[PDB]
Amino acid sequence: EALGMVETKGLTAAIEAADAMVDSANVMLVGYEKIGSGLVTVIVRGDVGAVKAATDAGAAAARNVGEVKAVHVIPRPHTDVEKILP
Amino acid sequence: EALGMVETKGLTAAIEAADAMVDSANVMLVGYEKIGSGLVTVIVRGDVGAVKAATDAGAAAARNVGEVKAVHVIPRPHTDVEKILP
Amino acid sequence: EALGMVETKGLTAAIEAADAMVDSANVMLVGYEKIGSGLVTVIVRGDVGAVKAATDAGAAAARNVGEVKAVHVIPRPHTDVEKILP
Amino acid sequence: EALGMVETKGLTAAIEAADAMVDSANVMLVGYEKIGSGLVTVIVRGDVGAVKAATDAGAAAARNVGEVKAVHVIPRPHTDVEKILP
Amino acid sequence: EALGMVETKGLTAAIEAADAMVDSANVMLVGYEKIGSGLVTVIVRGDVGAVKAATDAGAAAARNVGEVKAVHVIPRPHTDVEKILP
Amino acid sequence: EALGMVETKGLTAAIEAADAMVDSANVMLVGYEKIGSGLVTVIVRGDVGAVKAATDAGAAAARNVGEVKAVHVIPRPHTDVEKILP
């Protein structure tokens, strides 16, 4: 099941993008990851359609609050990637 | 209950925002987070009114001391958001 | 009791603040906190008069060494803020 | 065996690179390394042909998400270097 | 018990400063501290005259190799400052 | 014995420096250090000639992959300096 990622500079922008991503026809919040330098990545999992819609809504929400750095969907992620997710 | 956040660049400004918010209204200080690049977010919970007054006061007190980067209120935060809060 | 904070760019200016502050007066050096972007916050506790004199003395001294980003005293922080302080 | 590294600005680009790499060939995902200013290095091991396939796949995928900082393959790292690798 | 500090951006410049300061009557190398962001402070202890000379020589040598951010001596450090040294 | 360091901005350029260094001369790779802001130091030990050959070769290989921030040799490091090396 697909993975939506929204990365911001700023935690308030990340919390808002998360809030905005989980209403959703089945996407749950996995968590966020800090890599230092003010950069926060929020990660959701769900079916590709709601995930695509959810990550778009996250980026638009976060953009109101802060700086959005990356927006991305991985529709069919490999098993091995799991081991690098929060 | 509602969620409030004030994100500052600087820890001194954040501690002032925190102290100003809890004296301004019936909110509870949930905690603060650091994400690097000098970014510190303080987070409060309470009803939507008290969180709105608390953030405005916390922003205003922080601005007297340091840089405020974001002020935001989530009036009805989704259950999944509990996951990623201090 | 009272809270004093001198925030500097770089560790050398923070060591200088700390030394000036604990020399100053009857106050306890708690330590310092890193928040990224080279910022270091020095934290002391003591009676309000000493913490006032000490943060004055710390800021003055740090300024001779490098950049002082913030200086603040909170005479009587709220109990919930105490929970989040270093 | 060979060593493959793709280095990106940000975690969202690094996760894309990582997914693309393990998906594209018979390589083992080691993990990733944070080094500050937002830079993340993804590291993979496998035979030289697959590592060349995977680092190519990884870097082209990541360019669509964010900035790629380095792309490199070491067919046969020295023993002393094996010692210091993730 | 005087304290010499040289703060560099970059570890090579710091190692070079350390090696140039200790060649010196009695000044001993205390250690170095990283605060993130590329910033390293080298700290020496010894008598005031030899520490002033050591830190001037260390800053000169470090500037040959990298960027020097602060240079400072505290002639008579308070005993509580030891708490925040590496 | 002599001391060689190459400091890169980027982990990928540092691994390349380390590999090129030990394939260049009779050096031991002591290890690498991270200090934030993308800066990685690779350190080698050996007689002065080899350490000079190695750092030149490590620098030259890293530059084909990323930025080199510093290249330095200490031919006769003070014994005090061994305490701060990895």
From TrEMBL, chains A, B, C, D, E, F:
The keyword rRNA processing does not apply. SMART domains: BMC. Residues 2-86 form the BMC domain. One of its GO terms (biological process) is 1,2-propanediol catabolic process. Keywords: Bacterial microcompartment. Gene3D superfamilies: 3.30.70.1710. It holds the Pfam family BMC. InterPro entries: Bact_microcomp_CS, BMC_dom, BMC_shell, CcmK-like_sf, CcmK/CsoS1_BMC. GO terms for cellular component: bacterial microcompartment. Pathway: Polyol metabolism; 1,2-propanediol degradation. It is found in: Bacterial microcompartment. SUPFAM superfamilies: CcmK-like. The 1,2-PD-specific bacterial microcompartment (BMC) concentrates low levels of 1,2-PD catabolic enzymes, concentrates volatile reaction intermediates thus enhancing pathway flux and keeps the level of toxic, mutagenic propionaldehyde low. Belongs to the bacterial microcompartments protein family. CsoS1 subfamily. This is Bacterial microcompartment protein homohexamer.
